[PDB]
Design a binder for this molecule. Structure first.
Ligand SMILES: [Fe+3]
Ligand SMILES: [Fe+3]
Ligand SMILES: [Fe+3]
Ligand SMILES: [Fe+3]
Ligand SMILES: [Fe+3]
Ligand SMILES: [Fe+3]
Ligand SMILES: [Fe+3]
Ligand SMILES: [Fe+3]
Ligand SMILES: [Fe+3]
Ligand SMILES: [Fe+3]
Ligand SMILES: [Fe+3]
Ligand SMILES: [Fe+3]
Ligand SMILES: [Fe+3]
Ligand SMILES: [Fe+3]
Ligand SMILES: [Fe+3]
Ligand SMILES: [Fe+3]
Ligand SMILES: [Fe+3]
Ligand SMILES: [Fe+3]
Ligand SMILES: [Fe+3]
Ligand SMILES: [Fe+3]
Ligand SMILES: [Fe+3]
Ligand SMILES: [Fe+3]
Ligand SMILES: [Fe+3]
Ligand SMILES: [Fe+3]
Ligand SMILES: [Fe+3]
Ligand SMILES: [Fe+3]
Ligand SMILES: [Fe+3]
Ligand SMILES: [Fe+3]
Ligand SMILES: [Fe+3]
Ligand SMILES: [Fe+3]
Ligand SMILES: [Fe+3]
Ligand SMILES: [Fe+3]
Ligand SMILES: [Fe+3]
Ligand SMILES: [Fe+3]
Ligand SMILES: [Fe+3]
Ligand SMILES: [Fe+3]
Ligand SMILES: [Fe+3]
Ligand SMILES: [Fe+3]
Ligand SMILES: [Fe+3]
Ligand SMILES: [Fe+3]
Ligand SMILES: [Fe+3]
Ligand SMILES: [Fe+3]
Ligand SMILES: [Fe+3]
Ligand SMILES: [Fe+3]
Ligand SMILES: [Fe+3]
Ligand SMILES: [Fe+3]
Ligand SMILES: [Fe+3]
Ligand SMILES: [Fe+3]
Ligand SMILES: [Fe+3]
Ligand SMILES: [Fe+3]
Ligand SMILES: [Fe+3]
Ligand SMILES: [Fe+3]
Ligand SMILES: [Fe+3]
Ligand SMILES: [Fe+3]
Ligand SMILES: [Fe+3]
Ligand SMILES: [Fe+3]
Lengths: 203, 203, 203, 203
């Protein structure tokens, strides 16, 4: 035996006490190890957060794709963001199953559909909405991370940091920069031009 | 003038009576022409049908992706079907905007999450569920088509026939054939083998 | 014999009663079958509609190609639209002969030549004119389709739906989006910039 | 000076107090910095854990490579797992030397050699054994991580998370899925078929 900063290390002897950690009933995960209910439930929450964000971005896409709005760069940007939030949800679903939890998909609420806001202009308002949405997803990611830290699940904390937190802060800066640019160019010709550059970036 | 089977043809003279059909208020679609509220609402219904079907297939994927179920071909099949139903929804959203209607995304209900059914076996039960889901989407597509026929919207009927109905009957035969094969191979080794062939088809 | 929803199916026996349906006089179409006078006349109307639309677009091209107007993207756009409307006319002429009708080209009226409209600006006014023209062609296409439905000519209805109606609604959305963009960018630098993007799209 | 959440930041001035942190005796590591004895000892434990796991997998390989067992896919799977556990040990040895600790290789115990288990069947029993072994290695990795957290060694925690924990949970799901599949296919033809698919995966 070895005790290292209070942590007991039992030496390697045999694989048999762990054979009891091989479940013998077919409805139970065999992979699950040190993956507690709180972390399972917090992953399920973040799946519903990302999916709802995907749906919200699809609603934004549907508005700017209107012929009388005609901001194709915005529409494509919001469509791709919807695809991305859904990929996040899917990656979290795969992770849940990798750790042996159960994915529990919840309801998705009606999102906002109209983004007609003449004072700021539709484009600036919607990009600010997108920024707020990303910050909301980031808050939930931080909640998820706090659960994982409290449960001493270091594989989960690293998963969240490496797979989601870094992309999240990069998405927020990018959209923040879009808001700043839209404020600088102003409504009308400036917005249209920004939209054309968005369309070119989106290839 | 020419009246042909009761249909009045006025000869081509000038483009001015149609300039009044160019809306001058910015919140109204300029494209909209002979696209009535019933067709707009029926497209919105089919968008919600396809999206709910996408969500249901994602829930199916999440179950078969479990380590204790371990039917990777099924999981991938259901994941791809979820992607496909979402693409259908998106194509219908694009169409709505092409015709000048408004996309109205509605709520998505909690789907079924557990497909543990020992008598039929999980694989056969889920493939039968998928078949029932496709038939449900086909019924809604037929409702949508009946609205378009009643409203004399021939571009919409052709759109529905060419873009969705043909794929729909092809999907149903494919999944029907999967059900038939799963019944023939039986539970256990047969199901696993069918799953391996599904995985190979899915590249 | 078989009667199916009221439709009499006589079984296949021989090809001789149809030899009388092989005309023996050289001025008559041998191909013509279930292609009635109303459909022949409605196709001839749509040929004259598309040709007049071609001529109108050529007049628009001739205005924006002026050195003091100098909107080359618009000029090229209207030139290509003129080519396209003429191709539609030609495709309808080919179809008329495929079905065994007679093409009857009618007169083309003097179109509008001056599009100097300072309040909206030449570019916005002309794009709205183009939108109205496309909607006028779409109305005639719907008249043509209604004749074909009433005459129970399903090959013709499908021809109209597949070859013209889908392109027509796509052209209308595209031009509607152009109108919306021109309103957003405003006269002067915005219009010129929109024109430059039109020129780039037109390769 | 700057104190930030209690953490003292002394400003950059010169490199001389750290020249005393350059050891002048040849038997001492010059690299070692903030790498305490508990972390050094915990790395040495995990090296012995991975090596023992390598040896156990080699014993498994040696059994299934027998002509009367003849499960070549299993034999190759266990051989490659043995190579992988040894690579883990080696990577941990390299890390120990990177941080300036001393690698201390310990004894390796006789592993189990016979895996003749007729009730479950040799293949299912051995795959469950492998699962238990991976879970045992994961427990030790968690012990190692807890030592590093307690000693505030963030480079070590990240090393463990990025290099080992993620692969570990992926290995466990993969082997869990193998157990589930072996249970589904059953002994005899099913096991042989699973073995053939294992052999194909292993290229
Ligand atoms: Fe546990
Ligand atoms: Fe637990
Ligand atoms: Fe795309
Ligand atoms: Fe993914
Ligand atoms: Fe659970
Ligand atoms: Fe559940
Ligand atoms: Fe509105
Ligand atoms: Fe935290
Ligand atoms: Fe990282
Ligand atoms: Fe990183
Ligand atoms: Fe950018
Ligand atoms: Fe400007
Ligand atoms: Fe540009
Ligand atoms: Fe930019
Ligand atoms: Fe109308
Ligand atoms: Fe209407
Ligand atoms: Fe894929
Ligand atoms: Fe699409
Ligand atoms: Fe509406
Ligand atoms: Fe609305
Ligand atoms: Fe269950
Ligand atoms: Fe119908
Ligand atoms: Fe078709
Ligand atoms: Fe077809
Ligand atoms: Fe197939
Ligand atoms: Fe069998
Ligand atoms: Fe196979
Ligand atoms: Fe097959
Ligand atoms: Fe006839
Ligand atoms: Fe006739
Ligand atoms: Fe040219
Ligand atoms: Fe042609
Ligand atoms: Fe004639
Ligand atoms: Fe003149
Ligand atoms: Fe003039
Ligand atoms: Fe009709
Ligand atoms: Fe068609
Ligand atoms: Fe079509
Ligand atoms: Fe365009
Ligand atoms: Fe300007
Ligand atoms: Fe430009
Ligand atoms: Fe453009
Ligand atoms: Fe130190
Ligand atoms: Fe020390
Ligand atoms: Fe090898
Ligand atoms: Fe190495
Ligand atoms: Fe030492
Ligand atoms: Fe022996
Ligand atoms: Fe033995
Ligand atoms: Fe820890
Ligand atoms: Fe990492
Ligand atoms: Fe990582
Ligand atoms: Fe695998
Ligand atoms: Fe068998
Ligand atoms: Fe095989
Ligand atoms: Fe396999």
């Amino acid at each position: 035996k070895e005790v290292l900063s209070g942590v007991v290390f039992q030496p390697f002897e045999e694989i048999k006490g762990e054979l009891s950690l091989v479940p013998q009933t077919p409805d139970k995960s065999l992979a699950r190890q040190k993956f507690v209910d709180e972390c399972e439930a917090a992953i399920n929450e973040q799946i519903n957060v990302e999916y709802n964000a995907s749906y919200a971005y699809h609603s934004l896409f549907a508005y700017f794709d209107r012929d009388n709005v005609a901001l194709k760069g915005f529409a494509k940007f919001f469509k791709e963001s919807s695809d991305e939030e859904r990929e996040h949800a899917e990656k979290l679903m795969k992770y849940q199953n990798t750790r042996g939890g159960r994915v529990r998909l919840q309801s998705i609420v009606t999102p906002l559909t109209e983004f007609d806001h003449p004072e700021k202009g539709d484009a600036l308002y919607a990009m600010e909405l997108a920024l707020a949405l990303e910050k909301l997803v980031n808050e939930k990611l931080h909640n998820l991370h706090a659960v994982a830290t409290r449960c001493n699940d270091p594989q989960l904390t690293d998963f969240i940091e490496s797979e989601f937190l870094a992309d999240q802060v990069e998405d927020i800066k990018k959209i923040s920069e879009y808001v700043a640019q839209l404020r600088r160019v102003g409504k009308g010709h400036g917005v249209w031009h920004f939209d054309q550059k968005l369309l070119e970036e989106e290839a």
